[PDB]
Design a protein around this ligand. Structure first.
Ligand SMILES: [Ca+2]
Ligand SMILES: [Ca+2]
Ligand SMILES: [Ca+2]
Lengths: 171, 114, 114, 114, 171, 171, 114, 114, 114, 114, 114, 114
């Protein structure tokens, strides 16, 4: 079965103060998208770059996640360092992901340029940054996910099949 | 002996993924807030959506969390000018002796403004 | 053990003042006719409006008479050609052992024609 | 202590004769399937119709089989693109202690696909 | 009072040959935008990367500028190094700024892809690159500034209030 | 005469298995674009980053190419490293090129966000990444080339004149 | 004994920020070029804008540099086909004995083409 | 040695009677406020009108109070969105040695808001 | 000490050749009628054109007779319904001590009707 | 004694650069596949393009590889609904004694689907 | 040494079944009339269709009778007003020494009128 | 062993008389230039016309000079923007051993520009 990583990056959620509905939303979306068998590998971590790096590396190298989706820590706030941790652990970056997500959100909020999400590849693993806002989660995934199964195809990863009524990937 | 439970939530777009997810979140939050232990406690659940949401049935999300044996119905909300856009509303009919003032209603995201 | 109560009323114009007033009148008349003593007796209340009424939520009028702890929902009525225009309909779900033939339904103004 | 009963049926055309007949058939089948012996057992009945059906009130058919003392309400269904056309849906609220998994829901004609 | 940095990067202007109307334009715009008290910290420097870095660092760390706006040295010309100096002094970058400015200018000039402006954060300071062209100044600021007061909000900086008739920021 | 570099990056083509029609297409396009004298400097190399870097450096520094156009190795495939080799040999990057190419292709394929092309400057040389797909070559060049003659102008390079009926550069 | 001073400048967009800034720049440059020491020397100032500029009054920019006691007027320029777009023109009426050939007129940005 | 005098006034409708009257009132008030004793003191007078006023020439009103030997010119004002509607503006060019800060400008009716 | 000079002329068509020629004729006639000996006597010259004339700048004609060092400005006239079509108007600001009643204004072709 | 040679190729856009390049590629590939050594072997070459390609003549590309002395003709293909978009087709008439089953036809890019 | 063979046929409707059948009939009749024994004798075959026929490729019909190794091309005919509607035309290029006046051309159905 | 012959000619109007005459002229000139002595030498002749010529078949003109036993076909040319208007093109397929560089192609009237 394909293994997909979900990383919630939030001091408040990892401290057990706020509930993590951002992470729950991603899992719900992925369950709606995929019709093929897959195992969610999920973890909540604080906004500490050392921890994030270690987490992403553990998920891609040790636990063998073809796709790792992070949420939170992509803003201009002092503690938001998820993109930096992502850039540190990846050997190649995918500028097209952050470009498209910001492009789709700008039709709504002018403050979409304050978002700093990127995407990259560590070995055969695709890592994608989503914003912390639970409402923005679905719209962000919906924008970039139609390209993700084909990306994973090119890295000899698992062949993800999708629910067409929910989402249509291009090959 | 029945108590209604109201819920509401907003979405940022008219897509199936967004509507279903928001509905699931709202439904799960409604059940937890009131301490419901089984779907067997529900007489029925009714949904409404504003006219700017047409891509999906909210009732589909309830079936994603196993509400198969629960009767569901959906309808369109009144399209009042200037009213909050993109709202999913829920009315759950709950078999309970809970006092009216002890029932907990759930308003999420921008729907808190309601 | 629940009994529905139906009400209906017409208005002469699609304005908020008219819709809310008519709704309040109908609601108050529905409660009085059936001898209801407390809002705690109501499981829920559902409203519908015809498509020629869009300026206001009927549910707002119920909150004007203190139905804050009562769960409310509104929807649009089927727009049948030649059907009575500008109708507000109410379905109150009442926790009672009143026999079906002893429940009193309330039809006001031109809505009497229904 | 209430259980909802869901029904649905399709028609081939938006005419009053078709909508009323289909509704009567569905209603009668819903009652028989659950062994209901009297209209007095019904708290209320709610109907929805898709936007391609506007010629008649489904509630009229219920009155054709003597549901005069039963409270009825109708609304419009969400018009989802690609969704099954021309559907009449029913939610009957039934005063019963029947277990949730022992209630029988009725889907007729092309509505079986739902 | 909020302190805002204006840095003109130009060999000709710092040498006193050409007049700096690019820098004057930014100050005029900011005076039109802001209704709250603020102090302009302004300086003209040559296209030397060591000097630019030192200047930006002095303005953000020592003089405590919440916003620093640079102009010039963002092109493919041999001496244009303002983005490099910016990337050197910032701990986190904001790709969304350069992306949007180039996107708005492409509707006019196809040569908007020759622009290399970026934006970044040094501590609690936002640094934004504007092109040298005085005419392009207003249109570039107008594009990104509606997000800047909220960005500064997220960094516990000064609460900038704006003239709505001139510009409308989103919060 | 102006000298323009064409670099085909492909293991299969350099091994002599597949024919290089991608490289031939670029030369055909450039012949259609330019009415001024120019010399094509062309080479096929494998997807090895050390080789690509050396190649680009040899073309820009030793053979004095004002423009170097590469094709291939811009995808998420394990061996695709052309953008990395490009970023290594350039002193300044041009984000606007990759941004526009992905923007024009997204109107067709959602998988345009899997493209990782960039552009940069090494001294007085502009290096631009094109995808490997021969069909995408013309549309990608057509998008960015109207800015290239003016870019080369700003670096004191050769004055390229164009066939207006084929393409119209802006100055 | 009056001398007119002409100025002109272009903008790249019809926004208030651009028009006001360009006007301020032009005005300041006009005054400096002619060595004017006080606003009291100005009888009046007249502006025109092309029809593609409607978002702002040029006169507003003059008040931004303290020309409150100077009388200002603005009008629309003739919209000649193929003529230079987005031009702000100024005619300042200056109380001076400066010879006609010693007055300095100021044309900025793309307006130099005029 | 010339001083401009600014005036402005609004009207409630685009009719000749209204525009001419308002202009006469403004003109007479401008002259009185500055203590002008003869039309011979005026080099010229320029008018502008907003685009919502087309029925009459303001210059006609000046001739109604005998300004026949005074040169008059009129033009259209810039049509800024959201700007004050229906405004007649005047710039009189006055031959005087009056200091700039001693000239009196006249803004009448809703034009006071300017 | 300034006197305005008014001129006006009509054309039969909206072409550049016609507008420029008519303007030159009017300008030359204005200067001759008042005995002006040099362009240095002119503070400034302002033109207006009716909305049915858009093909050319009147200011261009003044430069055809060497008014290069004279400041020129043009604007659009108010488009009054039923008013004389296709009119070029001129206001020259003349540095002179000529009495107001000794200045000569020039109205040519069909513009005499004004 | 003549043999036709068919070719086809697709493009992703209706631009001259794309059409000419694709045509050159196809033409060169057609010649190589059949071992043609000189343009003198060609009686004529005919092209067709689908209706979604209008920006360029395919015949121009043949002249880019020196087919000046070869007679060329182009026409529009039948616009069948649902048929492959953006196709350039070639029919070369070749003077040869090559057997019909030894002639090699060339289908490139998405045109392979044909 | 080549001879063209012309054919033509009409259809009564723009459907694939009709166009393909008519084409097959015409093609088979063309071959028989001239005594052709093998498809190897054909250099190439060209089709045209009038603009009122778009549903199918005529070339498809030739492949239905095994003309796979024969090169085929199709184009649109000139749409002359009042000209015969719905015509499929064929030009077969035949390798033969048959005299020009001994070649047999085939015109079928209403196409005989041509 | 076949050689194509290209011709082209323009007309000033889309009328039958013009198209037929121009075609006859071109055809006669094509034959003379190459020294053809009989129509029996022609395998076939193909015409194209630009989309701005629809009033007549070019093939009709060939029959006016007795090309009855010669097979003719016509098609529409690609409508390239900015391309030469109103062009009749001819491709004659000639049975000859003439070298490719000894065939003479004929371009008449404004078609010389091609
Ligand atoms: Ca791995
Ligand atoms: Ca600081
Ligand atoms: Ca070099």
């Amino acid at each position: 079965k394909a293994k997909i990583g979900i990383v919630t990056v939030s001091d408040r959620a990892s401290a057990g103060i706020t509930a993590d509905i951002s992470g729950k939303a991603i899992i719900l979306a992925l369950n709606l998208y995929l019709t093929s068998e897959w195992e969610p590998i999920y973890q909540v971590i604080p906004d500490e770059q050392d921890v994030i790096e270690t987490t992403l590396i553990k998920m891609a190298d040790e636990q063998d996640c073809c796709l790792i989706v992070t949420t939170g820590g992509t803003g201009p706030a002092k503690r938001d360092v998820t993109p930096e941790a992502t850039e540190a652990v990846c050997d190649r970056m995918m500028p097209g992901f952050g470009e498209l997500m910001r492009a789709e959100s700008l039709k709504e909020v002018p403050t979409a340029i304050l978002s700093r999400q990127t995407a990259g590849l560590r070995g055969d693993s695709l890592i994608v940054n989503l914003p912390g806002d639970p409402a923005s989660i679905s719209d962000c995934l919906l924008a970039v996910f139609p390209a993700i199964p084909y990306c994973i195809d090119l890295m000899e990863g698992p062949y993800l099949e999708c629910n067409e009524a929910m989402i249509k990937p291009f090959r | 002996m029945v108590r209604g439970i109201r819920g509401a939530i907003t979405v940022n777009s008219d897509t199936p993924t967004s509507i279903i997810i928001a509905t699931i979140l709202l439904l799960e939050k409604m059940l937890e807030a009131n301490g419901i232990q089984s779907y067997e406690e529900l007489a029925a659940v009714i949904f409404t959506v504003t006219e700017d949401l047409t891509s999906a049935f909210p009732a589909e999300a309830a079936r994603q969390i196993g509400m198969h044996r629960v009767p569901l119905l959906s309808a369109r909300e009144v399209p009042v000018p200037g009213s909050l856009p993109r709202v999913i509303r829920v009315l759950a009919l709950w078999n309970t002796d809970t006092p009216q003032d002890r029932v907990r209603h759930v308003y999420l995201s921008e729907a808190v403004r309601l």
